[PDB]
Design a protein around this ligand. Structure first.
Ligand code: 1QJ
Length: 288
């Protein structure tokens, strides 16, 4: 009887807001996102528009419903599996090289797809990639367009202008050095963030993680400084050279440069082949 859109039965809250739901018409399991209508800065209706523009892309979740009902703005999405962060903790924060490469291949393509649809994600983090369910269990999905920005005109492909003095929009742990410097984010920053996520998977933690400071402000300065002070060769020591090559390539991109996604994917595909890993989708979580 407690429904949203007069169709989706409201279930347990799973994230602080995201709930489990059930489509009463189909019997299908869904995820429900609620935004208090009285919030200071409304984001859900804007985010729904981004999801809608992304529909049809590989690993883009389907948006089933959106609207305002009582005290909330509502968005209903198809139910997906756990996030890569949930899976990483489930695997005791250690992923094998094979799993990192299988993930890298799909994550680069998800980012490329968002960029082909004229947006930058701006919050590339393990928490924002989810595995599918059932038959789509080997498919990596990208979520959360709350911080996404249009970087180019849909018609002309004119890139947004270079701008400085920007607030940190994203997670400090994975932010590109340009983001720390307050430079307007662009295609390169989503890819650089992905490079840190892959190194976080390789290492189990990042060298600028767990830094202590009196305030959030001083904490972000310490993360920024530590990230600046750590050469890519030091960060990637003891891991295949492809991870350093990937990161140097992303840091070398100019503000409005179109990244070579095919080259970056091929670096990791060539390493997968050289390693002699089996061509299956047996991730580390399937070995537990
Ligand atoms: O793992 C179950 C699961 C979680 C999520 C999820 C995790 N963070 N945010 C969402 C979400 C949910 C509904 C929505 F409309 C938009 C975003 C989505 C789908 N399936």
């Amino acid at each position: 009887e407690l429904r949203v859109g007069n169709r989706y039965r409201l279930g347990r809250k799973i994230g602080s807001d995201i709930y489990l739901g059930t489509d009463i018409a189909a019997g299908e399991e869904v995820a429900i996102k609620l935004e208090c209508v009285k919030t200071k800065h409304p984001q859900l209706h804007i985010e729904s528009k981004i999801y809608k523009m992304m529909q049809g892309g590989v690993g883009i979740p389907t948006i089933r419903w959106c609207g305002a009902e009582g005290d909330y703005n509502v968005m209903v999405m198809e139910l997906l599996g756990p996030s890569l962060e949930d899976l990483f903790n489930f695997c005791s924060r250690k992923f094998s090289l094979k799993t990192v490469l299988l993930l890298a291949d799909q994550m680069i393509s998800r980012i490329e797809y968002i960029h082909s649809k004229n947006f930058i994600h701006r919050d590339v983090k393990p928490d924002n990639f989810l595995m599918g369910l059932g038959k789509k269990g080997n498919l990596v999905y990208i979520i959360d367009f709350g911080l996404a920005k249009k970087y180019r005109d849909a018609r002309t492909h004119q890139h947004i202008p270079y701008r400085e003095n920007k607030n940190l929009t994203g997670t400090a742990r994975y932010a590109s050095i340009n983001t720390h410097l307050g430079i307007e984010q662009s295609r390169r920053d989503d890819l650089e963030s992905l490079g840190y996520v892959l190194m976080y998977f390789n290492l189990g933690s990042l060298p600028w993680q767990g830094l202590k400071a009196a305030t959030k402000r001083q904490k972000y300065e310490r993360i920024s400084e530590k990230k600046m002070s750590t050469p890519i060769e030091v960060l990637c020591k003891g891991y295949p050279s492809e991870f350093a090559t990937y990161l140097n390539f992303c840091r070398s991109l100019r503000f409005d440069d179109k990244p070579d996604y095919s080259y970056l994917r091929q670096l990791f595909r060539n390493l997968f082949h050289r390693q002699g890993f089996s061509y299956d989708y047996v991730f580390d979580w399937n070995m537990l």
